Amino acid sequence: GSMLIDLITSCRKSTVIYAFVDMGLSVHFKDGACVNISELASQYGLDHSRFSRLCEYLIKIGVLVSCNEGVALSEECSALADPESMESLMIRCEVSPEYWKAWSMYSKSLYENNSKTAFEIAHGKPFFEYLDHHELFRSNFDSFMSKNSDKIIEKLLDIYDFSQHNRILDVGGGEGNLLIRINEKIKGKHYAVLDRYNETPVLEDIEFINGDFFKLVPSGYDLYILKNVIHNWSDSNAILILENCRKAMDDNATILLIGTVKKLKLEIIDSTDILMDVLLLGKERYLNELEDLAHQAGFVVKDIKEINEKYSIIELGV
Amino acid sequence: LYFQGSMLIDLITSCRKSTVIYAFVDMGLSVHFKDGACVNISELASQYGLDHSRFSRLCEYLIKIGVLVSCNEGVALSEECSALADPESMESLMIRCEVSPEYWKAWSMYSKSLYENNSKTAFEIAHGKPFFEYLDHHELFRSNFDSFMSKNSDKIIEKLLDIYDFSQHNRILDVGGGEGNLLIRINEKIKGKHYAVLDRYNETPVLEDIEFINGDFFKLVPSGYDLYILKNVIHNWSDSNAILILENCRKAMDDNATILLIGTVKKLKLEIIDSTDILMDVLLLGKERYLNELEDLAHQAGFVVKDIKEINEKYSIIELGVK
Ligand SMILES: Nc1ncnc2c1ncn2[C@@H]1O[C@H](CSCC[C@H](N)C(=O)O)[C@@H](O)[C@H]1O
Ligand SMILES: Nc1ncnc2c1ncn2[C@@H]1O[C@H](CSCC[C@H](N)C(=O)O)[C@@H](O)[C@H]1O
Ligand code: NA
Ligand code: NA
């Protein structure tokens, strides 16, 4: 059962990558620089032989590659060299006590018809409520989300004309990095961000609204953006968000759904689908499923545009 | 389109494969997947009161990682993952340990354990006690761990009996034998011997054919046995702690007596042995060893290496004598 034992012990890959990132030595691996294990251990005060053993495993799983009298990050794993990279922040969330405690309650959550989220069962609060009481975890999560916007922003500005819109609300925009990046290219607009803040953010070019899209969505916007929001929610909660958007919107107003649309048979989509179930009782959805939500909320699909293998844009109207 | 960082993101999210396998095992449904049976997702969901769509979405991911395969009526276990059908399999019990809060929190502190100035295991930094002391105060975690180890013996017993004549011996001590399942399985084939097990017990087990001894192999090993078995013990320990166990064995043994070292050897450059090397570091500041490194421990402890025989790609038996 060599394949089954490889699958069972898959978590050991995530935990050694976490350990590498957490040691704060990634700065020295930048631009594929060849780092000497001995020089690194002496500098940091690390156990040489034990750190060497870690490096050998990181080579075997393809994070590190052997270089002349040392080790370097593989080209595919170069992002780990930057501690503020999406991938560096992602691993901190992935093997967090928040995540693995939530995962432990997944099996229990699947048996219960009107289950609380596996996360709520584990922690006594739903995911976004929990973020209010955990500054460090929220900071890491919000920054991780901001770096996700950085990865698709170039492709986004190409395939959709944002200049046609004058009043733009980022619904669940968090730090508001989407509108920060859009603002860099598109100036002289009204940019607003709706989210839940302990302390409401302040920027010169972006307005921030401390609210709750289950209570109401602000009216007076001709574009409503929902990036990586819908997949956080059950069908009932998703419809309630779209319904609140509908009550806010006049007949000419646009909704942009930005995020994963299930179609390409990718493992990262399937695995993220199960994580959304664990954390939020959310899901990744097929177009027809998103279409069904849209219709029920009183919208129609006007257009679909592919960003990449993971992400598409869905333009809603009415 | 892009696939920017897809390989790194796959490695980062690798733990999701462990946690869905845990969830599948923990649901206790694998019995319906026995003998490569084709399972209808809607029927199983109905029978157990599962949310049909949530359970179908789990099954889809399990197909993608290779645990399940499509059949005409729904899903079957892949031949490769058929062991998950048995809820008492080594693999079923392994995943319970692998994604235990004990392991997760130990892994969190691995980065802090590697600092030269420190001498504590990542496990002790996490839990405030070392691994084996922690077992004493946590019955559920100990039960899963001891059960996991017993099933490891079930996997190798057939091959082990084929490559070593246990019938030649009269008195056999299983040093760190836990539940004593290695001796239970030997006793089924080879009868009339004196079988004893040494380990740390809150309640000393009782069996008709097997004697259980509550002890500490760092203090002393019971004398008067002609075979001492150290199965999956050496890799738990530093060189000095390993030599101390072997020294206590030599002091206990007469000139005629045999030690059998049974365990994992670094031979074929296997990812699983490399990953277990790191796990042994995280839990116990232990390590996996090359054959020459094991020979060196034996020699330093004052033993002759008399025979080496392969069980499989991971496991070997090393026979030690005093002469
Ligand atoms: N009730 C609520 N009202 C407003 N925002 C909410 C909310 N519940 C969750 N959110 C926000 O929804 C966001 C989901 S994560 C996506 C963040 C951002 N749109 C991006 O794509 O990067 C988080 O910022 C979270 O704080
Ligand atoms: N000081 C000590 N004295 C005796 N046994 C000990 C010990 N420290 C650890 N052990 C035991 O060493 C074993 C390691 S796991 C190996 C279990 C068994 N021999 C098998 O192969 O399946 C555990 O059962 C643990 O309880
Ligand atoms: Na769900
Ligand atoms: Na099961």
XYZ file of C-alpha atoms and ligand atoms in Angstrom:
695
model
C 0.000 0.000 0.000
C 2.783 2.499 -0.961
C 0.256 4.829 -2.751
C -2.238 4.781 0.225
C 0.586 5.541 2.758
C 1.841 8.401 0.488
C -1.752 9.848 0.495
C -2.134 9.306 4.316
C 1.206 11.138 5.011
C 0.518 13.970 2.434
C 0.156 16.462 5.396
C 3.957 16.042 6.125
C 4.652 18.005 2.865
C 2.465 20.940 4.116
C 4.058 20.912 7.648
C 7.745 20.928 6.432
C 6.899 23.834 4.008
C 5.275 25.651 7.013
C 8.441 24.953 9.129
C 10.690 26.315 6.280
C 8.524 29.509 5.996
C 8.193 29.925 9.816
C 12.020 29.845 10.427
C 12.235 33.244 8.586
C 15.256 32.105 6.470
C 13.392 32.399 3.082
C 14.866 35.945 2.478
C 18.299 34.218 1.850
C 16.810 31.926 -0.906
C 15.660 34.950 -3.057
C 16.434 34.948 -6.858
C 17.385 31.207 -6.642
C 20.529 32.123 -4.585
C 22.649 29.038 -3.567
C 22.564 28.909 0.313
C 25.220 26.912 2.306
C 23.407 24.762 4.980
C 26.392 25.111 7.432
C 26.679 28.958 7.070
C 22.836 29.198 7.490
C 22.726 26.987 10.670
C 25.703 28.834 12.329
C 24.180 32.331 11.588
C 20.628 31.475 12.865
C 21.837 29.115 15.648
C 20.171 25.996 14.088
C 21.102 22.293 14.667
C 23.170 21.525 11.485
C 22.483 17.729 11.099
C 18.723 18.080 11.914
C 18.351 21.079 9.491
C 20.301 19.084 6.798
C 17.751 16.205 7.226
C 14.862 18.724 6.632
C 16.658 20.081 3.479
C 17.073 16.473 2.088
C 13.272 15.904 2.491
C 12.505 19.338 0.882
C 14.733 18.246 -2.089
C 12.865 14.865 -2.293
C 9.385 16.602 -2.464
C 10.817 19.198 -4.937
C 10.775 22.461 -2.858
C 14.638 22.623 -2.782
C 17.128 21.585 -5.524
C 20.825 20.674 -4.929
C 23.294 23.531 -5.856
C 27.161 23.779 -5.752
C 28.070 23.358 -2.009
C 24.491 24.194 -0.793
C 20.692 24.214 -1.543
C 18.375 26.610 -3.516
C 14.543 26.922 -3.807
C 13.260 25.151 -6.990
C 11.942 27.529 -9.739
C 8.356 26.163 -9.161
C 8.651 27.021 -5.382
C 10.521 30.416 -5.773
C 7.492 32.273 -4.196
C 8.516 30.847 -0.734
C 11.615 33.162 -0.956
C 9.161 36.120 -0.427
C 7.572 35.954 3.080
C 4.695 38.309 1.977
C 3.890 36.136 -1.145
C 0.345 34.638 -1.521
C 1.934 31.148 -1.066
C 3.915 32.122 2.127
C 0.671 33.515 3.699
C -1.426 30.570 2.319
C 0.666 27.852 4.153
C 0.300 29.839 7.472
C -3.555 29.537 7.059
C -3.431 25.913 5.725
C -1.740 24.264 8.819
C -3.125 26.823 11.376
C -4.835 25.397 14.513
C -7.972 27.157 13.067
C -7.875 24.864 9.958
C -6.843 21.467 11.445
C -9.370 21.744 14.374
C -12.091 22.565 11.755
C -10.982 19.531 9.627
C -11.244 17.215 12.727
C -15.032 18.067 12.924
C -15.696 17.570 9.134
C -16.828 13.885 9.582
C -19.301 14.954 12.336
C -20.635 17.898 10.187
C -21.388 15.508 7.223
C -23.812 13.410 9.407
C -25.867 16.469 10.622
C -28.649 17.654 8.197
C -28.670 21.355 9.377
C -25.073 21.170 10.732
C -23.133 24.185 12.009
C -19.865 24.613 9.993
C -17.139 22.091 11.036
C -15.207 25.319 11.960
C -18.003 26.547 14.333
C -18.202 23.031 15.931
C -14.393 23.219 16.524
C -14.114 26.884 17.704
C -17.595 27.923 19.061
C -17.909 30.762 16.430
C -18.416 30.841 12.621
C -15.276 31.669 10.533
C -15.857 35.441 9.948
C -17.077 36.022 13.576
C -13.871 34.216 14.772
C -11.707 36.658 12.679
C -13.092 39.559 14.864
C -11.413 38.071 18.031
C -8.121 36.852 16.375
C -6.058 39.835 15.001
C -3.012 37.706 13.890
C -5.099 35.047 12.010
C -7.325 37.786 10.392
C -4.218 39.858 9.363
C -2.697 36.722 7.685
C -6.066 35.823 5.998
C -6.842 39.426 4.798
C -3.249 39.779 3.361
C -3.573 36.295 1.683
C -6.843 37.520 0.020
C -5.114 40.832 -1.059
C -2.244 38.864 -2.781
C -4.942 36.770 -4.614
C -6.250 40.056 -6.194
C -2.615 40.964 -7.173
C -2.321 37.667 -9.182
C -5.376 38.274 -11.510
C -5.605 42.141 -11.633
C -3.628 42.485 -14.934
C -5.852 39.895 -16.747
C -8.995 41.453 -15.123
C -8.394 45.028 -16.503
C -7.865 43.562 -20.055
C -11.113 41.488 -20.390
C -13.521 43.954 -18.620
C -13.926 47.741 -19.222
C -14.065 49.232 -15.660
C -13.928 52.809 -17.166
C -17.648 52.415 -18.239
C -18.565 52.453 -14.463
C -18.442 55.648 -12.259
C -19.626 54.378 -8.792
C -18.074 50.971 -7.836
C -18.698 48.982 -4.582
C -16.347 46.057 -3.673
C -18.861 43.844 -1.739
C -16.802 41.836 0.830
C -13.584 43.480 -0.504
C -11.658 43.143 2.820
C -8.478 45.328 2.658
C -9.920 46.647 -0.674
C -6.780 45.599 -2.647
C -8.935 44.914 -5.782
C -10.043 48.619 -5.952
C -6.529 49.791 -4.792
C -5.047 47.994 -7.891
C -7.939 49.079 -10.261
C -7.465 52.707 -8.959
C -3.736 52.599 -10.066
C -4.898 52.342 -13.758
C -8.474 53.854 -13.539
C -8.562 57.306 -11.769
C -11.409 59.860 -11.211
C -13.933 57.169 -10.059
C -15.854 56.595 -6.762
C -14.337 53.430 -5.145
C -16.065 52.020 -2.000
C -15.368 48.744 -0.066
C -18.067 46.967 2.064
C -16.796 44.541 4.790
C -16.726 43.906 8.597
C -13.932 45.915 10.363
C -12.906 46.175 14.062
C -11.225 49.446 12.854
C -12.596 50.941 9.549
C -9.695 51.442 7.065
C -8.824 54.958 5.675
C -7.336 55.636 2.170
C -7.286 58.885 0.073
C -8.838 57.343 -3.127
C -10.968 54.482 -1.559
C -14.002 54.824 0.816
C -14.468 51.947 3.368
C -17.977 51.021 4.724
C -18.174 48.934 7.964
C -21.432 46.973 7.329
C -22.985 43.490 6.871
C -24.214 42.356 3.374
C -26.844 40.128 5.162
C -28.465 43.315 6.676
C -28.200 45.576 3.557
C -26.000 46.454 0.535
C -25.644 50.251 -0.047
C -27.619 51.704 -3.041
C -26.243 54.366 -5.468
C -23.577 52.182 -7.229
C -23.660 51.240 -10.977
C -21.140 48.339 -10.373
C -21.286 45.763 -7.488
C -18.204 43.413 -7.373
C -18.406 40.060 -5.465
C -14.852 38.552 -5.696
C -14.355 35.192 -3.840
C -17.584 35.807 -1.769
C -20.323 33.460 -3.182
C -18.188 30.262 -2.607
C -18.070 31.117 1.179
C -21.882 30.559 1.513
C -24.735 27.976 1.355
C -27.396 28.420 -1.410
C -29.783 30.169 1.102
C -27.043 32.588 2.402
C -25.754 33.198 -1.209
C -29.338 34.128 -2.385
C -29.730 36.497 0.657
C -26.516 38.385 -0.431
C -27.722 38.597 -4.110
C -31.266 39.619 -2.890
C -29.763 42.466 -0.733
C -27.666 43.533 -3.824
C -30.920 43.474 -5.939
C -32.840 45.719 -3.436
C -29.805 48.138 -3.556
C -29.579 48.163 -7.413
C -31.540 50.124 -10.066
C -32.308 48.520 -13.495
C -29.041 49.800 -15.178
C -26.671 48.508 -12.377
C -24.153 45.626 -12.955
C -23.010 42.795 -10.603
C -19.587 41.185 -11.359
C -19.143 37.684 -9.787
C -15.314 37.109 -9.751
C -14.033 33.695 -8.564
C -13.947 29.944 -9.319
C -16.591 28.571 -11.768
C -16.483 24.715 -11.677
C -15.783 23.323 -15.220
C -12.036 22.415 -15.520
C -11.392 19.086 -13.674
C -8.564 20.495 -11.443
C -7.643 19.007 -8.011
C -7.080 22.532 -6.479
C -10.792 23.303 -7.312
C -12.031 19.969 -5.771
C -9.805 20.440 -2.636
C -10.915 24.136 -2.221
C -14.578 22.958 -2.672
C -14.100 20.635 0.395
C -12.254 23.401 2.385
C -15.230 25.793 1.748
C -17.520 22.989 3.104
C -15.272 22.578 6.247
C -14.710 26.313 7.007
C -18.021 27.874 5.838
C -20.458 25.148 4.528
C -19.705 26.917 1.196
C -18.986 25.300 -2.209
C -17.494 25.868 -5.675
C -20.404 25.996 -8.207
C -21.058 25.113 -11.900
C -22.337 27.966 -14.154
C -25.954 26.581 -14.128
C -25.834 26.528 -10.251
C -24.612 30.197 -10.168
C -27.267 30.902 -12.894
C -29.984 29.295 -10.630
C -28.855 31.525 -7.659
C -28.821 34.628 -9.969
C -32.385 33.961 -11.350
C -33.806 33.270 -7.810
C -32.293 36.643 -6.628
C -33.906 38.361 -9.696
C -30.838 38.657 -12.043
C -29.811 37.254 -15.500
C -26.304 36.255 -16.781
C -25.276 38.850 -19.453
C -21.737 37.429 -20.131
C -18.961 35.027 -18.897
C -15.178 35.651 -19.394
C -12.303 33.276 -18.382
C -9.495 34.881 -16.272
C -7.488 31.602 -15.950
C -7.927 27.818 -15.197
C -9.364 28.652 -11.696
C -11.218 32.002 -12.158
C -13.937 33.451 -14.461
C -15.992 36.719 -14.474
C -19.854 36.434 -14.539
C -21.688 39.713 -15.470
C -25.239 39.843 -13.933
C -27.998 42.399 -14.804
C -31.630 43.316 -13.784
C -4.916 29.480 -18.703
C -1.976 30.512 -16.385
C -1.341 27.714 -13.764
C 1.029 30.176 -11.930
C 2.436 28.393 -8.814
C 0.140 25.309 -9.277
C 2.908 22.823 -8.217
C 3.776 24.868 -5.029
C 0.003 25.313 -4.219
C -0.446 21.484 -4.645
C 2.405 20.871 -2.098
C 1.014 23.605 0.271
C -2.526 22.003 0.144
C -1.180 18.363 0.399
C -2.601 18.155 4.001
C -6.179 18.363 2.477
C -5.601 14.776 1.138
C -4.747 13.522 4.701
C -7.788 15.316 6.251
C -10.352 14.007 3.657
C -8.963 10.443 4.144
C -9.328 10.915 7.971
C -12.962 12.138 7.468
C -13.753 9.148 5.148
C -12.237 6.664 7.728
C -13.902 8.467 10.712
C -17.416 8.218 9.087
C -17.152 4.368 9.455
C -18.712 3.665 5.965
C -15.647 1.922 4.371
C -17.218 -1.487 5.330
C -19.650 -0.945 2.337
C -16.487 -0.579 0.112
C -15.244 -4.107 1.166
C -14.103 -6.560 -1.602
C -14.010 -3.671 -4.174
C -17.862 -3.392 -4.011
C -19.490 -0.665 -6.200
C -21.263 1.792 -3.806
C -24.290 3.916 -4.910
C -23.690 7.441 -3.392
C -27.449 8.372 -3.162
C -28.369 4.986 -1.508
C -25.475 5.230 1.051
C -26.335 8.917 1.824
C -30.039 7.891 2.364
C -29.121 4.866 4.601
C -26.829 7.008 6.887
C -28.795 10.333 6.706
C -25.860 12.182 4.994
C -26.408 15.371 2.922
C -26.368 13.701 -0.575
C -24.636 16.677 -2.373
C -22.044 17.332 0.426
C -21.143 13.570 0.484
C -21.064 13.357 -3.372
C -18.591 16.363 -3.326
C -16.335 14.473 -0.807
C -16.499 11.349 -3.095
C -15.500 13.488 -6.180
C -12.333 14.770 -4.372
C -11.535 11.181 -3.167
C -11.687 10.053 -6.882
C -9.343 12.951 -7.895
C -6.625 12.044 -5.268
C -6.981 8.299 -6.192
C -8.774 6.860 -3.075
C -12.022 6.070 -5.009
C -12.633 5.123 -8.689
C -15.867 5.429 -10.761
C -18.027 2.289 -11.270
C -21.384 1.950 -13.142
C -23.524 2.507 -9.946
C -21.206 5.109 -8.254
C -17.771 4.643 -6.543
C -15.442 1.799 -5.413
C -12.152 1.900 -3.421
C -9.108 1.744 -5.769
C -7.249 -1.610 -5.345
C -4.335 0.582 -4.028
C -6.557 1.981 -1.169
C -8.529 -1.285 -0.469
C -7.055 -1.293 3.128
C -9.410 1.654 4.047
C -12.324 -0.895 3.706
C -11.057 -2.523 6.969
C -11.654 0.027 9.793
C -9.066 -1.934 11.895
C -6.378 -1.851 9.090
C -2.900 -0.391 9.865
C -3.726 2.433 7.350
C -7.173 3.186 8.943
C -5.447 3.591 12.377
C -2.361 5.373 10.891
C -4.450 8.348 9.567
C -6.054 8.778 13.078
C -2.511 9.399 14.511
C -1.226 11.328 11.454
C -3.828 14.191 11.687
C -4.271 13.974 15.525
C -4.201 17.365 17.339
C -1.040 15.866 19.025
C 0.783 15.602 15.633
C -0.552 18.953 14.232
C 0.572 20.976 17.316
C 3.977 19.147 17.432
C 4.458 20.048 13.683
C 3.652 23.763 14.509
C 6.678 23.782 16.934
C 9.140 21.952 14.556
C 10.581 25.373 13.440
C 11.202 26.323 17.154
C 12.749 22.858 17.962
C 15.488 23.234 15.242
C 17.195 26.174 17.101
C 20.690 24.989 18.283
C 20.207 26.468 21.834
C 17.079 24.249 22.468
C 17.146 20.507 23.500
C 13.317 19.836 23.756
C 11.277 17.817 21.154
C 8.771 19.851 19.050
C 6.154 17.585 20.770
C 7.323 18.613 24.302
C 7.450 22.345 23.249
C 3.812 21.898 22.027
C 2.351 19.661 24.830
C 4.637 20.350 27.877
C 5.483 16.572 28.187
C 7.580 14.219 25.980
C 5.678 11.801 23.638
C 5.728 8.594 25.803
C 4.983 10.465 29.104
C 2.035 12.141 27.246
C 0.658 8.638 26.286
C 0.213 7.932 30.088
C -2.311 10.849 30.534
C -4.216 10.451 27.174
C -5.961 7.013 26.923
C -7.690 7.660 23.512
C -4.440 8.869 21.801
C -2.468 5.947 23.395
C -5.219 3.431 22.335
C -5.096 4.563 18.631
C -1.221 4.618 18.712
C -0.846 1.145 20.384
C -3.542 -0.276 17.978
C -1.718 1.315 14.955
C 1.558 -0.397 16.108
C -0.213 -3.814 16.607
C -1.467 -3.718 12.953
C 2.101 -2.900 11.747
C 3.075 -6.345 13.234
C 0.091 -8.018 11.418
C 1.450 -6.708 8.027
C 5.012 -8.196 8.415
C 4.352 -11.375 10.556
C 3.965 -13.815 7.579
C 7.295 -12.671 5.964
C 9.013 -12.436 9.429
C 8.209 -16.136 10.326
C 9.476 -17.173 6.821
C 12.953 -15.497 7.218
C 13.602 -16.253 10.965
C 13.126 -19.591 12.844
C 11.488 -18.460 16.165
C 10.896 -22.176 17.104
C 14.678 -22.522 17.906
C 14.102 -20.243 20.997
C 12.418 -21.131 24.366
C 12.093 -17.734 26.185
C 11.234 -14.644 24.003
C 10.936 -11.036 25.365
C 9.292 -8.331 23.148
C 11.185 -5.165 24.328
C 8.730 -2.218 23.912
C 6.115 -4.654 22.490
C 3.135 -2.447 23.568
C -0.055 -4.606 23.260
C 2.261 -7.615 22.517
C 0.559 -8.302 19.126
C 3.910 -9.399 17.546
C 4.111 -12.232 20.189
C 0.301 -12.921 19.919
C 0.765 -13.531 16.123
C 3.993 -15.637 16.615
C 2.257 -17.675 19.432
C -0.603 -18.589 16.973
C 1.982 -20.444 14.740
C 4.722 -21.444 17.311
C 3.295 -22.771 20.652
C 4.779 -23.894 24.020
C 7.404 -21.062 24.281
C 7.639 -18.542 27.196
C 6.438 -15.228 25.605
C 6.859 -11.988 27.653
C 6.329 -8.268 26.713
C 8.176 -5.287 28.346
C 6.560 -1.783 28.053
C 5.127 1.127 30.163
C 1.521 0.320 31.326
C -0.977 2.230 33.564
C -2.705 -1.222 33.796
C -0.460 -4.278 33.014
C -2.269 -6.329 30.302
C -3.201 -10.007 31.060
C -3.173 -12.933 28.527
C -3.056 -16.768 28.997
C 0.030 -17.466 26.754
C 1.791 -14.003 26.994
C 3.293 -12.501 30.221
C 3.272 -8.632 30.424
C 6.039 -6.772 32.368
C 5.628 -3.078 33.369
C 9.166 -1.589 33.171
C 11.598 0.959 31.660
C 14.272 -0.364 29.208
C 16.433 2.721 30.191
C 16.635 1.371 33.818
C 16.995 -2.393 33.010
C 15.766 -5.246 30.713
C 14.484 -8.548 32.224
C 17.217 -11.289 32.311
C 16.946 -14.991 31.314
C 15.502 -14.691 27.741
C 17.305 -16.316 24.741
C 15.602 -13.890 22.229
C 15.101 -10.096 22.763
C 12.986 -8.372 20.005
C 13.334 -4.553 19.447
C 10.643 -3.845 16.762
C 10.176 -0.170 15.664
C 12.014 0.999 18.889
C 15.515 2.168 17.693
C 14.167 4.922 15.315
C 12.362 6.573 18.337
C 15.759 7.436 19.958
C 18.994 9.491 19.669
C 22.298 7.533 19.235
C 23.051 7.755 23.023
C 19.481 6.690 24.069
C 19.568 3.843 21.447
C 23.003 2.606 22.780
C 21.661 2.800 26.414
C 18.713 0.443 25.472
C 21.157 -1.967 23.708
C 23.641 -1.816 26.677
C 20.756 -2.715 29.091
C 19.869 -5.639 26.713
C 23.543 -6.877 26.705
C 23.692 -6.682 30.569
C 20.409 -8.734 30.720
C 21.628 -11.334 28.112
C 23.914 -14.414 28.539
C 26.528 -15.494 25.888
C 23.962 -17.704 24.008
C 21.165 -15.039 23.712
C 20.015 -13.185 20.513
C 18.661 -9.641 19.833
C 16.474 -9.116 16.691
C 16.389 -5.420 15.578
C 13.199 -5.215 13.390
C 12.468 -1.852 11.726
C 12.834 0.657 8.881
C 16.311 1.075 7.241
C 17.374 3.950 4.912
C 18.163 1.884 1.725
C 16.178 2.765 -1.493
C 15.903 6.625 -1.447
C 12.172 6.358 -0.424
C 10.111 9.554 0.245
C 8.125 7.686 3.019
C 11.384 6.909 4.973
C 12.538 10.574 4.547
C 9.097 11.845 5.785
C 9.189 9.374 8.776
C 12.782 10.554 9.559
C 11.352 14.123 9.994
C 8.286 12.813 11.961
C 10.674 10.909 14.341
C 12.563 14.256 14.777
C 9.300 16.223 15.501
C 7.825 13.645 17.984
C 10.930 12.139 19.685
C 14.214 13.736 18.336
C 14.598 10.209 16.835
C 15.833 9.365 13.296
C 15.853 6.724 10.512
C 19.314 5.126 10.007
C 21.343 3.539 7.166
C 22.396 -0.120 7.716
C 26.014 0.984 8.578
C 24.615 3.434 11.240
C 22.566 0.573 12.846
C 25.684 -1.733 12.686
C 27.626 1.118 14.439
C 25.021 1.386 17.302
C 25.211 -2.447 17.783
C 29.076 -2.406 17.776
C 29.235 0.576 20.271
C 26.739 -1.321 22.546
C 29.223 -4.288 22.432
C 27.333 -6.674 20.035
C 28.320 -8.778 16.969
C 26.072 -8.184 13.871
C 25.435 -11.875 12.969
C 22.802 -11.592 10.146
C 20.805 -8.974 8.114
C 17.620 -10.118 6.239
C 15.147 -7.965 4.208
C 11.372 -8.082 5.011
C 10.536 -5.540 2.219
C 11.752 -2.179 0.696
C 11.370 -0.408 4.126
C 11.846 -3.147 6.812
C 14.885 -5.360 7.678
C 15.788 -7.688 10.612
C 19.325 -7.299 12.120
C 20.373 -10.315 14.303
C 22.810 -9.345 17.141
C 24.782 -11.705 19.426
C 27.424 -11.079 22.154
C 29.892 -13.608 20.522
N -21.577 39.682 6.523
C -20.558 40.168 5.822
N -20.630 41.444 5.373
C -19.598 41.926 4.664
N -18.463 41.327 4.314
C -18.422 40.063 4.771
C -19.400 39.427 5.511
N -19.017 38.125 5.803
C -17.836 38.001 5.252
N -17.422 39.136 4.600
C -16.154 39.328 3.910
O -16.142 38.571 2.727
C -14.760 38.401 2.329
C -14.572 37.012 1.768
S -12.875 36.647 1.278
C -12.717 37.600 -0.255
C -12.059 38.958 -0.044
C -11.914 39.800 -1.320
N -13.217 39.999 -2.022
C -10.949 39.102 -2.276
O -11.398 38.512 -3.268
O -9.737 39.137 -2.051
C -13.911 38.721 3.569
O -13.197 39.937 3.390
C -14.947 38.827 4.695
O -14.583 39.700 5.746
N 11.284 3.519 28.541
C 10.561 2.614 27.887
N 10.533 1.337 28.341
C 9.798 0.434 27.675
N 9.072 0.590 26.569
C 9.113 1.865 26.148
C 9.813 2.904 26.730
N 9.632 4.076 26.011
C 8.844 3.732 25.024
N 8.492 2.405 25.047
C 7.624 1.706 24.109
O 8.260 1.588 22.858
C 7.231 1.325 21.869
C 7.564 2.051 20.588
S 6.428 1.724 19.214
C 6.770 0.002 18.805
C 5.679 -0.923 19.313
C 5.876 -2.400 18.953
N 7.237 -2.878 19.324
C 5.662 -2.595 17.448
O 6.618 -2.717 16.677
O 4.523 -2.636 16.988
C 5.900 1.756 22.508
O 5.061 0.637 22.762
C 6.339 2.454 23.802
O 5.411 2.353 24.856
Na -21.403 22.985 1.651
Na -15.295 5.322 6.211
